[PDB]
Homo-oligomer: A and B are copies of this chain.
Amino acid sequence: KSCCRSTLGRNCYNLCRARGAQKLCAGVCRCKISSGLSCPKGFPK
């Protein structure tokens, strides 16, 4: 699950995923990919 720092981080992320992989986009937009089903408090978006 993709968890982001901000809404801007979300856009950037949803839009990167068209062309890029999960990890490339995660790193580029400043988003995290968790194991659980819930998104951390620091990456709500």
Output the least CB separation between A31 and chain B (Å). Answer: 15
Please give, as numbers and ranges, the residues of chain B lying within 8 Å of A19 by CB-CB distance.
Answer: 34, 36, 38, 40
Interface residues on A, range: 10 to 19
| Smallest CB separation, A32 vs chain B (Å) | 13
> Can you name 5 A-B pairs with beta carbons within 8 Å?
A17-B36, A18-B38, A19-B40, A21-B36, A22-B35
On A, residues with C-beta under 8 Å from B are: 16-22, 24, 34-38, 40
| In the complex, chain B residues whose CB is within 8 Å of the CB of A35 | 20-22, 24
Complex alpha-carbon distance, A40 and B18, angstroms: 9
Bound-state CA distance A28–B22 (Å) is: 27
